[PDB]
DNA sequence: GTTAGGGTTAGGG
DNA sequence: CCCTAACCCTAAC
């Protein structure tokens, strides 16, 4: 079962989540907007890798 | 349960 | 063996 690579549905939705409900508020983001099967851990570590190299918030 | 960084597994090069 | 990245662990909140 090949590991799922995040798509813009998830990532673009996440970016919206960060802007509309704050970055470090993955709970709120998960409540407001749905994803395939993500957690606070997933969302945060995704955004972590992203900002670490690209620097967005 | 969530949050936050450390760190391994998966993926591709 | 390196980079980016999804998963997984340790630690703290």
UniProtKB/Swiss-Prot annotation:
Highly expressed and ubiquitous. Isoform Pin2 predominates. It comes from the Eukaryota. Residues 1-55 form the HTH myb-type domain. Induction: Expression is tightly regulated during the cell cycle; levels are low in G1 and S phase and increase during G2 phase and mitosis. ADP-ribosylation by TNKS1 or TNKS2 diminishes its ability to bind to telomeric DNA. Ubiquitinated by RLIM/RNF12, leading to its degradation by the proteasome. Ubiquitinated by a SCF (SKP1-CUL1-F-box protein) ubiquitin-protein ligase complex, leading to its degradation by the proteasome. It is found in: Nucleus; Cytoplasm, Cytoskeleton, Spindle; Chromosome, Telomere. Residues 26-51 bind DNA. Binds the telomeric double-stranded 5'-TTAGGG-3' repeat and negatively regulates telomere length. Involved in the regulation of the mitotic spindle. Component of the shelterin complex (telosome) that is involved in the regulation of telomere length and protection. Shelterin associates with arrays of double-stranded 5'-TTAGGG-3' repeats added by telomerase and protects chromosome ends; without its protective activity, telomeres are no longer hidden from the DNA damage surveillance and chromosome ends are inappropriately processed by DNA repair pathways. Homodimer; can contain both isoforms. Found in a complex with POT1; TINF2 and TNKS1. Interacts with ATM, TINF2, TNKS1, TNKS2, PINX1, NEK2 and MAPRE1. Component of the shelterin complex (telosome) composed of TERF1, TERF2, TINF2, TERF2IP ACD and POT1. Interacts with RLIM (via N-terminus). Interacts with FBXO4. Interaction with TINF2 protects against interaction with FBXO4 and subsequent polyubiquitination and proteasomal degradation. Interacts with GNL3L; this interaction promotes homodimerization. Interacts with TIN2. Interacts with RTEL1. The acidic N-terminal domain binds to the ankyrin repeats of TNKS1 and TNKS2. The C-terminal domain binds microtubules. The TRFH dimerization region mediates the interaction with TINF2. This is Telomeric repeat-binding factor 1. It comes from Homo sapiens (Human). The chain holds residues 378 to 434 of 439 of the full protein.
